[PDB]
């Protein structure tokens, strides 16, 4: 869900 | 000393002003609310009532009586707070996740006691209501999923729920495709005055959170179902300008103590003075030179967070501070890498720490309310409208960044998402419905619900983008940010001309149009208001929508007096003709003309009401649903596929990839089958022996005779791709199959073949529902879709192979929009089954190892490859190829490096292939002995 980068 | 009484989170941070509404309408005692989600911790300390004697269900016996009344023979009482639990998806093999549903439920109705380990008590919006907890999860398809939560809705209504929160959804799905049972459940809830609140979704726009959609393609909404149902209240996520946050403290050069927000994964030691060191973006080991024993301070960018965190641990860091590379960004929850403490901070705070002298930082144990780096700003992840059918969603916005609530195993955590926004609005809706039972007692429940939704949307505050100097688009924020104080105080609301909703849909517009709204006054005295409309569109950066608003102009303030207990219409003329040239230069297929009609008691006072309007300057229903074929791209690129600039015609196939994240574009697929595998299936080899494999490739692509591991597009003189099949059952270029990158949803996708003489010779089975390719990610959807129903094997209606010639492979599909014309994309496909006529005799020259053929090959389609293979055993079986010399002969070698192994004459095979895949293979021995 959250940005990985 | 009496027992310690802790403050609640809302006592310190209440961005939506829930306390004002609670002062008017209570905290939920005697009321029941329902949460439909994926799983719950039913034993959480947050599930408690202050006075169970006021509850609707005082015991398991009261609940079973209600069940018997409605014929419900499943589900159970749990405790005084959780009056009902049922799992509607028990046939699922996967384990139950309890985090997300517990978190949502805590926002709606958590009621943690002062005995909690937390510094501040979680007290949800309706902390004294009882909960019905309903588990639903996908098990056997999306239709069955909808049938299951339709039953949960109906059970919730019949067990007395006043509001139902659904913090889940599936992106881009159309309302019309829901089962009738599901549509009837929504209507049943509305007929009983039961509110249903849905999350907008966390899918940003078409392309996802790492991309911007293309300015040529304005229908970039990704809101799905259940949110797309008109009767629900769909909630987007934004960040307020302040938030209760954990903090860290640093001594600066000219401000002594300086507190900054941190968002931590795992735990730093509170009140411990850590040292830190700058480590660039954490990409090289040299970055972590002075990091041993300290906190690595790392800038966002280039590599993944988990990579930066692991690299810091490798160099002996005790923790990680990662600061944003965006200005006014949002806190991002960092991944847990082997328990490593890691905190995210803003760019301003990161740059401050970088240039700070005393590089020592201390984490504080008590959270406090600090300004947010983002200021008031809509969440980047929040799903944009419009719905598949083109209706206006979301409806409203609520805080959804880093919300602290209950999770599994009696714990608490912060989470971001529209799933956190929705239960806050659900709680506000429930309390406003309670207020209206006293304020409007002669209405029915359904009339009170309809009023509450209109007041919530009207009284919501249109959020303003300070950087762009315009209001955030209604397709992103709906009717504004919810405000429980304004909503509780409201005696007026505003709707469209037909009194159906607090939003105005204008469908297609020209540059001149009118916005008509009705102002409803429910008070005993006449009221005078000033109104004005904003006129705005999308901001555009180069070829992309910026996902930001562009102000065009605002109308002049006008006046209206609404008599008591009555309503009046007003009409605002809009004329954007002077902008059309510049806007059409940016958005050539049309653009939205949208805004808000804003109402005030006096032009210098604060906004009292606001209603959004949306129109499309163009023909929205007939926007192209399909991205043009990759073959028609000048630079070789597409939305999800970047080309090799030094080779724009290169187009490699699937290869040995496991996932299909590469090559997502519109094209035709086929298969390449080497001659060795064709032979092994003629002879009957069980499990294949050879070094070559069958590969899925794109039609119209061909390797070079001097193999280099790449395929390339070939085209006719006119420019179309050279697509050709040889339907002879050998698996080499036998078929074509449609692969599509859909920019919009579509229905009734079907492939047909035309003989270019005026007849349809074949028609595929129909694919009824097509969903837009709104991302290119395994966690959501891939950037293109392969449609197996469109596979054409070269046969006709009756089942006979069609004759040699060129045909039209036609793919038809229709957009979801009402009255949309059918669209289609055509491919020229050659059929040719003519076997190559190769030479049957050959003489060999022992002097120079040159093999002379008796005749040159004869093929119907142009020659693809003339080669001589040789298979040798290398460390147990490789196969390489030889190209013909310029005089026609082939030079055969005597060995082959691996070591070095000799080559017998029995190892060579003459292989001839045409551009349709027709192939002949003959051992060179049979050529010599003949
Ligand atoms: Ca074939
Ligand atoms: Na509003």
Author numbering:
A (entry chain B): 83 to 87
B (entry chain A): 94 to 781, 785 to 972, 974 to 995, 999 to 1030
Publication excerpt:
The Streptococcal C5a peptidase (ScpA) specifically inactivates the human complement factor hC5a, a potent anaphylatoxin recently identified as a therapeutic target for treatment of COVID-19 infections. The emerging view of ScpA and related subtilases is that selection of their substrates is a dynamic two-step process involving flexibility in the domains around the active site and in the C-ter of the substrate. Surface plasmon resonance (SPR) analyses of the ScpA-hC5a interaction have shown that high affinity binding of the substrate is driven by electrostatic interactions between an exosite on the Fn2 domain of the enzyme and the bulky N-ter cleavage product (PN, ’core’ residues 1-67) of C5a. ScpA, a C5a inactivating protease, represents a novel enzymatic approach to therapy.
X-ray crystallographic studies on the D783A mutant (ScpAD783A) were undertaken to better interpret the impact of this mutation on the specificity and activity of ScpA. X-ray diffraction data to 1.9 Å resolution were collected on a single crystal of the D783A mutant of ScpA (ScpAD783A, referred to as ‘D783A’) at the Diamond Light Source, Beamline I24. The structure was refined with PHENIX to R-work and R-free values of 19.84 and 22.89 % respectively. The data allowed for visualization of the catalytic residues and confirmed the proper folding of the enzyme. The final model includes D783A residues 97-781, 785-972, 974-995 and 999-1030. The electron density could not be assigned to three disordered regions (residues 782-784, 973 and 996-998 labelled ‘a’, ‘b’, and ‘c’ respectively in Fig. 1a). Note that the disordered regions include the D783A mutation.
